Design brief:
Number of strands of chain C: 0
Radius of gyration of chain C: 21 Å
Order of helices and strands of chain A: EHEHHEHEHHEEHEEHEHHHEHH
Oligomer: heteropentamer
Shape of chain C: globular
Shape of chain A: globular
CATH topology of chain C: ABC transporter involved in vitamin B12 uptake, BtuC
Radius of gyration of chain A: 20 Å
Structural class of chain A: alpha/beta
Distance between the termini of chain A: 49 Å
Chains: A alpha/beta, B alpha/beta, C mainly alpha
Number of domains of chain A: 2
CATH architecture of the largest domain in chain A: 3-Layer(aba) Sandwich
CATH superfamily of chain C: ABC transporter involved in vitamin B12 uptake, BtuC
Number of helices of chain A: 13
Largest interface: C-D, 41 and 43 residues
CATH topology of the largest domain in chain A: Rossmann fold
Helix content of chain C: 55-70%
Number of strands of chain A: 10
Order of helices and strands of chain C: HHHHHHHHHHHHHH
CATH class of chain C: Mainly Alpha
CATH class of the largest domain in chain A: Alpha Beta
CATH superfamily of the largest domain in chain A: Nitrogenase molybdenum iron protein domain
Structural class of chain C: mainly alpha
Strand content of chain A: 15-25%
């Protein structure tokens, strides 16, 4: 009985060969695992960053596949202290970080051959994903400037700098991150926004719904008086689809490149 | 006049079938022992208990021909003032700010300016006009609140209610506060009712006396009439003898 | 006859000056270092096509005037609140209005949302809890000073559990966007929000400025104020409403801002006096000054990110708390 | 002749009873599929229930005993603080030790780390700020009661802003970790941890219980306490150390836990008396009983979710502060 | 023998008690007279060694009780030689009358009952608060509270098998009957133990009535000392109190203005 913590790892585990094989059965996950439908059916033991071990053990695991974000350390230690093997994975925002989850989960689940099939499909579609983007820079000009909005604090946006999933996804789609000079997430100033002068606003489906839709995003202070705001240029995508860094990476990048290119027609 | 008739208040009934009246020009002293209604009597004459207090009052107290109950809080302030036993400022007001508050109930200004300063002289606090109240001895503070309450009753028949005003004052100022008050009472047509800790001070300074025993008034009249060993023994539970001077003074037998 | 504080207009004019001054300097910065030539065709008419309108009139000017409105609001409410409790520490958030707005705002963010409904979640939240705290403490009709603080903190516990419960079930977009609002920020300033607020605060200051003399009679004693014929219960009510309004309006869009209601009215009181006729104006002038002065370092000290000005007005209070420590320790 | 210090053993005994009884119910719940027959078989039987032999000794046993230590410690330190300030409101966090622990802990979530070197950050961070607060407030040497709150909440500003900086610059995993860890939780309880915690709180206890007769002569006045030849200034020191040691140890691994310091010693202050010989025991027992009850209600009310128990001990003082008001309204 | 000799004390800016010398004998009752804040509260504070006992105020001269300076006496041991009644406040907690009086046995310790508990009961009775043993002090009147605090200090000096009692205005806010009963006790306590009393009082008449010794303190120095007959004169009172006074006789003398 395997429990997986982290949406992309759940995608990887199911991508090796479904909910249950001769070698394993997935029995639980965290709330961020919304794709595919086999993951969503799984009982959930809370958000990936906050956990109760007795509840985790209530899903009766023999092994836990845990992302780098799985926590808190107190909860993980209680689970490890219960005798369940817990294997933690790294996040490096690049093909290498993804390949280690594919092959590592296959190793942990003892399905090496299935992992070899998944990695080969992924990497070939991945080379195609590099190629489709390289065929044409979105906009037909130099890499455009993209602001990724994670969420809003009232009327103030939280934006991704470097060392973010969004920074990597933006670069992979043939564009350039409008935010420079800081790491991780931080509230956006109108000053940051005007200096960043983004050509496109990228946002998640959840973030777009949370802010109130497309028009609500563009009326945010400072958004109107920017190239993206003057052109009302918004792209929304499912958060798990866009940022998860899992086996859907070539398709996620290809989709992002398309939506950027359509927005800059 | 300020007159209560068969005044009942009450949690027991503390003060029952009280009938008494203070009239302009006359200084009544309220004698009796602690927690026997004196403080409550003054609170009733003040109106603290009849505009919108949970305690029930019966009978009525009439302030110059009209019941208390039918007098606003502002209107009253112009007809009546009270000197609560003591209090400390809690903010560094100067003495002229505090005294000036006495003219608060008179509101549409240099005459309010004027009346402040003349009342500080009269109460013997003029030298303090600029000072900060949180730096004052208990006596300087008392002279200032006396100036402030005096500034409130002027006008150019009012009722001054004294709740043990001389307490914690040195000896010279006790008598000079009570002398001032009788001069104030005489010169204006102003009515004083004063709670006092020392009966001998009530004999010395009150033209009328009320002794509060039981919950009811047990003696009333001039000092010479009320200050007797019998009245004091019943009101105070305490053996008093009587001695003369060149007014009477009381000594325990 | 003298004698008085004659300093008082001098510390009010010089405070009026500096608030204007600081405000101009607040238009003259900062990030996206900017040239105003176009602004004149943008405000009205000038040679150059629309360009600095974009920022200076839509982005910058709303935040400065929001910083003035919030700083005069928390300063002025701080003045009448502490005049009420006779206690210099009474922050205007004792009505439960800072709690109430916080819950209102976090109940919207977690229970789908949209925009321009968040202010009114915070605002309706801020008023409803104030009335709850009142309805407990009062007894129809007189209320009592230590009770209002007791019912105040009991419900503070209630509303605060509802928050700690809400943050727990709240996903990650919820959490980071939560804390930042509870630290307070004018980063999302806009014109028809301070047109939405200003009729509240500017109404609130005027109900307050009119009860200023009854508020002076309190500070020598709630009972002698009664013998002066001030209707203390009504007074408490009028004050407690006016502040729950102005503070309820101002927290709705600014978030949790602290140490202005403690620092602003007290630095004017050691300056001159406790005279409420002159503490209300000055505490607004100073309070406005200081928030606009600390926001202009929320924007600018680390660019391009807004430190929440809560982190900054907290930086203000600590020394001026550590100051009056040193002014008080003789014997 | 005379009198009424009896009734208390009956309320201390029944408190000791109810504390143990509750520990068994706390032992005897987990994720809902576990009966007493196989639990007794696990602890005292064959290796068939050996997986339950892990939990009942490694997961549950340290979680329960932590709740009796956090509960007994916060209640007992609360009794002492409130005897010291002669004010039944003072929580053990007036020294600034709760803030400094919150800071030390959050200054390590953004450092370098891991792992067992975190409850040393919060414990050393909490101790440091408490020695700071004392060193400002102390005169070398007298001290003074209101100057300690002055300097305590002067630094409370400092810390809380260093936090507000950290939570701003902190990425998502760091920001989630903070918020819940400031709400407090015993979901980290394991044996080696509370084997390190216990000899502090049990030590802090024993310095206290030994001061108890000197604290009685404080409650009738600092000047008459001086006349009875209690060295007021030394005792103040010793209380402050022992409560900085216990409360520092305890917040370091349970997070910020409140309202046990305010509710526990005051429910036993109404039951019997304010007599420090009888309040410090009784407050550690009720304090424990309650938090254990409060926790187990967080283990299980929303299983498999583990509610922060700061949500629940807050749901515990809210009715029993509003009770308090119900009985003190007039006046 | 509590003896201050050339006692000088000052808090900036300027002295308050200058070049004083008083001594207080066991068995006699000294009543401190004089204007308010001429230093009597501060005189008393020195005799307890308050301003000496801290392990910022200037004191010179010497104050010695029973042969040893107030400086070198450890405070807990001074609690066994001297007790102080400062007109108190209501407490902060609902201590019962017994608990409070029991705290009077604090400087006598090693729990400490029962002999220390028996003593407490007799102090209340002697101080006239016996019918209050169970009551909660915060429910009491100012007069009932006062007699409990008088019981607590008595319960602190009870010999059974020479000590100094320092009363800071002990009868204020008592009824007439209660003032005199308290001072009569105090004199009886002073006589049957070989105990020494220093008492501030606000009625100069009560000082002639109950004090075997009187010290008049004007200007910050002691300007008259001795028996009531020697001290209670119009001349002494006029300089000490700034007030016209004439003496009156009875079958002790009293004081009348004008």
């Amino acid at each position: 009985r395997v429990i997986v913590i982290g949406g992309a790892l759940a995608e990887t585990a199911f991508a090796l060969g479904g909910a249950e094989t001769p070698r394993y059965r997935l029995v639980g996950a965290d709330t961020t695992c919304t794709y595919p439908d086999a993951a969503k059916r799984l009982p959930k033991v809370g958000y990936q960053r906050a956990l109760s071990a007795e509840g985790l053990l209530s899903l009766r695991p023999d092994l836990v596949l845990a992302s780098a974000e799985a926590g808190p350390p107190t909860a993980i230690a209680q689970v490890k202290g219960a005798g369940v093997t817990v294997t933690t994975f790294d996040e490096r925002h690049d093909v290498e970080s993804v390949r280690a989850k594919i092959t590592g989960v296959a190793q942990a689940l003892d399905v090496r051959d299935a992992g070899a099939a998944l990695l080969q499909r992924f990497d070939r579609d991945w080379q195609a994903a590099r190629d489709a983007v390289a065929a044409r820079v979105p906009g037909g000009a130099q890499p455009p400037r993209v602001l990724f909005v994670l969420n809003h604090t009232g009327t103030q946006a939280l934006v991704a700098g470097q060392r973010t999933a969004a920074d990597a996804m933006i670069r992979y789609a043939g564009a350039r991150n409008a935010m420079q000079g800081f790491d991780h997430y931080k509230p956006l100033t109108t000053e940051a926004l005007a200096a960043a002068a983004p050509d496109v606003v990228l946002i998640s489906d959840e973030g777009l719904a949370a802010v109130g839709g497309h028009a609500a995003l563009l009326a945010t202070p400072g958004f109107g008086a920017t190239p993206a705001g003057r052109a009302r240029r918004v792209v929304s995508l499912d958060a798990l689809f866009l940022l998860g860094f899992g086996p859907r990476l070539p398709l996620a990048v290809t989709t992002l490149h398309r939506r950027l290119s359509d927005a800059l027609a | 006049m300020l007159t209560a008739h068969h005044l009942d208040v009450a949690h027991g009934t503390i003060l029952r079938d009280l009938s008494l009246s203070i009239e302009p020009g006359r200084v009544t002293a309220l004698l009796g022992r602690n927690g026997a209604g004196k403080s409550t009597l003054l609170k009733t004459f003040a109106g603290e208990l009849t505009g919108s207090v949970g305690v029930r009052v019966t009978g009525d107290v009439t302030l110059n021909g009209e019941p208390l109950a039918r007098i606003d809080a502002p209107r009253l302030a112009c007809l009546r003032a009270v000197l609560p036993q003591a209090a400390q400022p809690a903010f560094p007001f100067s003495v002229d700010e505090i005294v000036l508050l006495g003219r608060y109930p008179h509101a549409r200004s240099h005459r309010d300016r004027d009346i402040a300063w003349r009342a500080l002289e009269r109460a013997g606090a003029d030298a303090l006009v600029g000072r900060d109240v949180t730096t004052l001895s208990g006596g300087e503070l008392a002279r200032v609140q006396f100036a402030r309450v005096l500034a409130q009753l002027w006008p150019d028949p009012r009722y001054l209610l004294l709740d043990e005003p001389t307490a914690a004052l040195d000896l010279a100022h006790q008598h000079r506060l009570l002398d001032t008050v009788r001069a104030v009472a005489r010169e204006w047509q102003l009515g004083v009712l004063a709670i006092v800790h020392d009966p001998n001070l009530a004999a010395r300074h009150a033209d009328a006396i009320a002794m509060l025993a039981d919950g009811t008034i047990v003696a009333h009249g001039a000092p010479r009439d009320v200050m007797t060993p019998a009245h004091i023994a019943q009101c105070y539970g305490f053996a008093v003898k009587m001695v003369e001077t060149g007014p009477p003074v009381m000594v325990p037998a | 006859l003298g004698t008085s504080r004659r300093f008082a207009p001098f510390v009010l004019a010089a405070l009026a000056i500096l608030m204007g001054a600081m405000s101009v300097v607040a238009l003259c910065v900062g990030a996206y270092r900017i040239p105003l030539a176009e602004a004149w065709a943008a405000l009205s008419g000038d040679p150059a096509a629309q360009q600095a309108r974009a920022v200076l009139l839509d982005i910058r000017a709303p935040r400065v005037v929001l910083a003035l409105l919030v700083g005069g609001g928390f300063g002025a409410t701080g003045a009448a609140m502490q005049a009420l409790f006779r206690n210099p520490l009474a922050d205007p958030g004792l009505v439960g209005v800072s709690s109430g707005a916080a819950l209102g705002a976090t109940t919207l963010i977690v229970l789908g949302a949209s925009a321009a409904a968040l202010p009114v979640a915070a605002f309706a939240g801020g008023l409803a809890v104030a009335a709850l705290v009142y309805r407990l403490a009062a007894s129809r009709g007189r209320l009592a000073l230590p009770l209002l603080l007791l019912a105040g903190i009991a419900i503070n516990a209630l509303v605060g559990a509802a928050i700690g419960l809400l943050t727990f079930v709240a996903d990650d977009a919820q959490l980071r966007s939560l804390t930042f609002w509870s630290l307070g920020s004018l980063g999302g300033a806009q014109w028809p929000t301070l047109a939405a607020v200003a009729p509240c605060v500017a109404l609130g200051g005027v109900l307050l400025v009119r009860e200023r003399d009854a508020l002076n009679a309190l500070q020598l004693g709630e009972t002698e104020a009664l013998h002066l014929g001030v209707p203390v219960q009504r007074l408490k009510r009028r004050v407690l409403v006016a502040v729950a309004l102005a503070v309820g309006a101002l927290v709705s869009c600014a978030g949790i801002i602290g140490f202005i209601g403690l620092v602003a009215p007290h630095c004017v009181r050691l300056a001159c006096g406790p005279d409420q006729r002159i503490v209300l104006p000055g505490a607004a002038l100073l309070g406005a000054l200081l928030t606009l002065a600390a926001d202009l370092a929320a924007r600018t000290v680390a660019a391009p990110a807004d430190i929440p000005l809560g982190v900054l007005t907290a930086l203000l209070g600590a020394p001026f708390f550590l100051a009056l420590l040193w002014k008080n320790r003789g014997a």
